[PDB]
Amino acid sequence: GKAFDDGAFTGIREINLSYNKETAIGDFQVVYDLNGSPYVGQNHKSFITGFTPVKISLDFPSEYIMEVSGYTGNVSGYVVVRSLTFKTNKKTYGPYGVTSGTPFNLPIENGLIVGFKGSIGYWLDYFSMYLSL
Amino acid sequence: GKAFDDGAFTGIREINLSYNKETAIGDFQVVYDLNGSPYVGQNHKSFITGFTPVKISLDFPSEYIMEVSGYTGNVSGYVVVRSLTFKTNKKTYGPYGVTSGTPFNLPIENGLIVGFKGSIGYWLDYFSMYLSL
Amino acid sequence: QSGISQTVIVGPWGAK
Amino acid sequence: QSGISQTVIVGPWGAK
Numbered sequence: 045g046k047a048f049d050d051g052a053f054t055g056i057r058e059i060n061l062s063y064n065k066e067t068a069i070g071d072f073q074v075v076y077d078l079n080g081s082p083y084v085g086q087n088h089k090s091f092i093t094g095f096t097p098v099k100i101s102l103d104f105p106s107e108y109i110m111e112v113s114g115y116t117g118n119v120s121g122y123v124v125v126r127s128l129t130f131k132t133n134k135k136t137y138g139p140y141g142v143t144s145g146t147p148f149n150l151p152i153e154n155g156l157i158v159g160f161k162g163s164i165g166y167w168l169d170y171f172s173m174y175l176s177l
Numbered sequence: 178g179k180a181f182d183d184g185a186f187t188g189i190r191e192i193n194l195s196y197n198k199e200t201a202i203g204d205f206q207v208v209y210d211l212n213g214s215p216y217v218g219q220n221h222k223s224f225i226t227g228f229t230p231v232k233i234s235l236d237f238p239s240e241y242i243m244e245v246s247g248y249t250g251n252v253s254g255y256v257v258v259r260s261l262t263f264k265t266n267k268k269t270y271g272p273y274g275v276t277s278g279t280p281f282n283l284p285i286e287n288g289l290i291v292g293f294k295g296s297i298g299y300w301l302d303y304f305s306m307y308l309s310l
Numbered sequence: 311q312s313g314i315s316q317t318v319i320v321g322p323w324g325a326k
Numbered sequence: 327q328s329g330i331s332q333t334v335i336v337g338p339w340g341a342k
């Protein structure tokens with residue numbers, strides 16, 4: 045996969061991702077907030093194409109993500125993120141993809157996701173999140 | 178179960194917990210650092226006996242936790258924390274308990290666990306961690 | 311603000 | 327120190 049690292053911002057306005065229902069999460073792009081202005085993040089694309097695109101448009105600043113969760117599993121020999129769900133104080137977006145494999149979740153009691161990093165090959169291999177008050 | 182919330186400190190010196198290889202995590206207690214003095218956290222005890230005690234004494238400050246992981250699952254009709262494992266930059270402590278049910282994990286690329294909170298009845302029901310740079 | 315300092319908290323894991 | 331500010335990071339998930 046190709047590594048990526050957006051760094052840290054001041055919050056999240058929009059998540060653009062893609063997935064396929066037989067495979068996994070494909071591409072990933074975030075529109076951050078930067079001091080109350082939109083910052084259009086790099087668009088991290090899979091080496092292949094075919095995925096169904098989704099736009100998660102949050103009602104910023106009142107709406108924010110409280111939990112990220114997903115499944116990892118094996119697709120044609122690759123262990124990847126097969127599913128993602130984003131739960132905010134307002135509602136749940138997802139699951140997008142295939143919800144089979146080993147689960148993971150990052151629930152947040154206090155604080156904000158303010159950036160993403162990770163790696164994408166054919167699919168989303170893994171990701172980390174920057175957190176801040 | 179009975180709620181506990183130790184608050185936030187400067188770091189972690191020692192974790193004392195108990196577990197049963199057929200059930201789940203029981204007692205939990207932490208010796209934090211507070212500006213260079215050990216802060217002896219309240220021993221948060223299970224309602225029941227019969228657990229095995231473990232002392233995780235860390236080489237503070239050069240050694241620190243990088244990943245907490247575990248399983249959650251049924252015991253007696255309750256969803257509880259069935260196992261924990263603590264990985265530092267120096268070694269791995271655990272798994273302690275029963276490594277069955279739903280996996281979870283919190284790996285940390287940057288920052289420190291500085292506090293625990295949660296609830297313990299017969300077993301560790303749930304927990305959260307305070308993070309700081 | 312209040313005069314109580316704030317910290318990031320992640321969790322909970324276990325029972326909901 | 328360096329002059330780059332820092333931020334808590336948690337992860338990775340995705341079989342690592």
Ligand SMILES: CO[C@@H]1O[C@H](CO)[C@H](O)[C@H](O)[C@H]1O
Pocket residue numbers: 178179255257297298299300301302
């Ligand atoms: C069997 O007693 C219980 O212990 C459980 C498992 O830990 C839960 O905490 C219950 O609330 C507490 O009443």
